């Protein structure tokens, strides 16, 4: 259109072999066209999508009684704004509904009668009735008293936001009543008002909705009118009418904007031939054109081919020639040549192959005018064919770290240092420049929990342990978690409980063997002219004793190290200990107050530099590199070249993950800084680890 001066967009037409799969790309590019290069379009024969969520929701309601009613499907129904307005559901309360149905434990079907209908054993829990009972007893009373009819109260709803509970309850009794109603076979004369009853019972009409309601009512009336006028009397089930409605509803199409004025996109209608100057075609690969529709099998016309018969194959073969002869100036024929995945070969259709063969056997290029007929044919075929490429495109980013100014306040909290030192790489992001990666809330689990893993079982172990150190009962707490629905059904809960309690007993008795009554204390001490304020909770007067049901890690032990440093800064003679699983133990001896303040000064300057620029302190891989290299007998640094490959092996095998442990390199905080680990940054990390973490093994015992 730039090359030719005047050509109306009314006088360009592009046909296509298949319309529905091709349409999203056409619509996307023609809606994403730029400003100056814009030209309008008019797509014809689009699939009829007038009120798509309303139609899909009504079809889902008409498919009611054969569904197990997953909570995901229930909320995918509930998202409709018309239903939300009718059942007075708000978008701000929708988040509360999401988190409450995710966390309150509503996973299986609607009710235990449906569960028994599906011949399964009656679990008696994990239903919508169970979840509503949980929610309403949480509304009534707190979760500290216990259980009233062996179901756990749910204290997340105790205010004025509880109206959505009754809203959802009314919705589910309406669903239950219509589930009961829509199962039995009925004749047509009382199948007639069912659609009207459904429409008025569920949907409040909006300004736009009446078109969809009229479509549904007209289709229902037409179907049962055909049935009644065809004189049928026996009852029919709901499934046949549901699939007939679903097939007939989307069979409507749009042929109302054929000559709007812009460029037109449409499929090849039969016998349609209009003169035009520009005609373009798409998708002439083998096996897609012409579309092959086999005869049904019992046909008798195909056995006796007479003159007036019509075949789709010959219809397409005639339409191609009619489209060719219906062109005046230009023709644009293209096809998919090579598969983009494996770079294999595909082939164009037989019609296009015949056309290019006739073209090649028709003319000759002006260059080699008398060389050879077949060589000239091959040259013409090579010259006419155009070959595109795979990708359209056939300052740089700088290093992210930059120095920053920072001040040193005279009064700093202990919790600030603890949060910085827990993980400095992410601590540079999460508090300094106020960026954090607030991940979206997770999925609702599909079914009841069979086994327990991760943070849930960690919390269960912690709640078992804080009672085991008190040596209180486990049976009531087991009943409370069974009412919570966080345990497997039946005696498997007791089987799990036996293993957990017997495994935690060996951790518990070690804490009992040295537990002493202690007290909390408030740190008010200065270092390098900087006052430090903090609260030290539950410190025994004769030392330290911490415990936590976790595996041993260097970052875990360094918390105890900092605890012992701040304990020795406030006088505080005596050793310190920490207990973990598998009887892992840590031991730190007391030292001089000046030495403790010197180490605290080193950590303070480390924090001061790390706040200005994100200092690289890897707590576990660097510790794995630095531990075996260090020898405890000499308290010095071995530097033999034999260990210079063992250190590489163990550091790499600790950094990159195994198939059983989560990859330490698989963390977006580290992935943001670089894409690939480099040996220079490795050496820098080794240097920082040797500069900072090395006092730990000097006093670990």
């Amino acid at each position: 259109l730039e090359e030719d001066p005047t050509l109306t967009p009314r006088d360009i037409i592009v046909m296509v072999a298949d319309i529905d799969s091709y349409s999203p790309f056409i619509q996307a590019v023609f809606g994403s066209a730029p400003a100056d290069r814009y030209l309008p379009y008019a797509i014809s024969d689009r699939r009829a999508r007038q009120s798509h969520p309303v139609l899909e929701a009504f079809i889902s309601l008409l498919s009611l009684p054969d569904s197990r009613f997953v909570s995901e499907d229930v909320l995918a129904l509930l998202d409709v704004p018309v239903l939300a307005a009718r059942f007075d559901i708000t978008e701000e309360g929708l988040r509360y509904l999401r988190q409450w149905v995710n966390e309150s434990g509503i996973r299986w079907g609607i009710d235990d009668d449906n569960v028994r209908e599906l011949e399964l054993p009656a679990t008696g829990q994990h239903t919508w009735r169970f979840g509503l009972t949980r929610m309403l007893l949480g509304y009534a009373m707190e979760s500290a008293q216990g259980e009233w009819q062996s179901v756990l109260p749910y204290d997340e709803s105790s205010g004025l936001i509880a109206e959505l509970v009754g809203h959802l309850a009314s919705l589910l009794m309406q669903l239950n009543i219509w589930r009961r109603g829509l199962a039995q076979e009925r004749p047509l004369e009382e199948w007639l008002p069912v659609c009207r009853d459904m429409l008025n019972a569920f949907f409040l009409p909006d300004a736009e909705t009446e078109a969809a309601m009229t479509l549904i009512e007209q289709q229902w009336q037409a179907i049962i009118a055909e049935g009644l006028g065809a004189q049928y009397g026996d009852a029919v089930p709901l499934s046949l009418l549901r699939d007939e409605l679903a097939q007939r509803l989307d069979q409507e199409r749009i042929s109302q904007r054929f000559l709007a004025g812009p460029v037109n996109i449409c499929t090849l209608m039969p016998m349609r031939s209009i003169p035009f100057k520009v005609v373009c075609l798409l998708g002439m690969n083998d096996g897609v054109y012409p579309r092959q529709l086999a005869p049904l099998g019992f046909d008798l016309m195909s056995q006796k081919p007479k003159r007036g018969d019509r075949s789709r194959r010959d219809d397409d073969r005639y339409l191609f020639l009619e489209a060719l002869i219906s062109a005046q100036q230009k023709l644009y024929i293209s096809y998919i040549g090579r598969s983009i995945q494996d770079n294999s070969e595909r082939f164009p259709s037989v019609l296009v192959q015949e056309l290019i063969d006739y073209i090649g056997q028709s003319h000759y290029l002006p260059g080699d005018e008398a060389l050879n007929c077949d060589e000239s044919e091959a040259r013409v075929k090579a010259h006419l064919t155009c070959l595109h490429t795979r990708m359209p495109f056939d300052k740089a980013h700088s290093e992210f770290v930059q120095p920053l100014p920072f001040t040193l306040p005279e009064t700093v909290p202990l919790e600030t240092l603890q949060r910085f030192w827990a993980h400095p790489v992410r601590a540079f992001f999460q508090m300094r420049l106020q960026v954090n990666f607030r991940t979206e809330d997770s999925e609702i689990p599909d079914t009841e929990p069979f086994i327990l893993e991760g943070l849930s079982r960690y919390q269960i172990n912690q709640q078992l342990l804080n009672a085991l150190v008190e040596q209180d009962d486990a049976e009531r707490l087991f009943r409370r978690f069974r009412a919570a629905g966080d345990l497997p059904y039946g005696a498997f809960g007791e089987i799990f409980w036996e293993t957990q309690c017997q495994e935690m007993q060996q951790l518990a008795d070690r804490v009992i063997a040295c537990r002493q009554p202690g007290q909390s204390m408030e740190i008010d001490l200065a270092c390098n002219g900087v006052q430090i304020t903090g609260w030290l909770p539950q410190v025994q007067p004769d030392g330290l004793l911490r415990w936590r049901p976790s595996l041993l890690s260097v970052a875990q032990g360094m918390q105890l190290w900092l605890e012992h440093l701040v304990y020795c800064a406030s006088g505080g003679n005596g050793e310190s200990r920490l207990f973990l699983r598998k009887d892992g133990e840590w031991r730190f001896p007391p030292l001089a107050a000046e030495q403790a303040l010197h180490y605290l000064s080193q950590l303070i300057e480390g924090y001061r530099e790390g706040m200005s620029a994100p200092l690289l302190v890897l707590p576990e891989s660097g510790g794995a590199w630095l531990k075996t290299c260090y020898d405890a007998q000499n308290d010095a640094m071995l530097d033999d070249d034999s260990t210079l490959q063992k250190a590489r092996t163990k550091f790499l095998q600790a950094y990159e993950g195994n198939m059983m442990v989560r990859g330490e390199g698989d963390d977006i905080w580290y992935q943001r800084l670089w894409r690939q680990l480099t040996p220079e940054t490795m050496e820098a990390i080794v240097e920082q680890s040797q500069r900072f973490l090395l006092p730990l093994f000097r006093f670990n015992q």
Partner: protein
């Protein structure tokens, strides 16, 4: 029973569907007097009431022939104290039960903790 009548009353907007849910889920198939009592106490709780004398709810009879429908159970049910205490959904303050009655007043049990601590604070 009373489910269609109280849905009609929800359409009348006199009693909230939340009150309907609370009464249904803590009554089930218990005494109809207990069902109406739960519905009315949930209604005044949604209003914002803190106390609920038994005489006021007894002589209200807002929606139904209370006496002529309630007299179906064993013995003299007009002695409403243990007539309610026969049901499992109420207790005098011994078990973790949502419904507690102390001073011929029936109300919520967290509200019972608050009301009894302020009642022993007052008198």
């Amino acid at each position: 029973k009373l489910q269609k009548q109280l849905l009609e009353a929800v359409e009348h907007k006199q009693l909230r569907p939340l009150d309907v849910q609370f009464a249904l889920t803590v009554a089930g198939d218990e005494h109809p007097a207990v069902t109406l009592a739960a519905a009315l106490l949930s209604h005044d709780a949604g209003e914002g009431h803190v106390c609920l004398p038994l005489s006021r709810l007894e002589n209200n009879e807002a929606s139904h022939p209370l006496l002529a429908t309630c007299v179906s159970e064993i013995g003299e049910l007009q002695n409403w104290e243990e007539c309610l205490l026969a049901s499992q959904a109420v207790s005098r303050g011994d078990e973790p039960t949502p419904m507690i009655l102390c001073g011929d007043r029936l109300y919520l049990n967290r509200m019972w903790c608050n009301e009894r601590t302020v009642a022993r604070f007052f008198n």
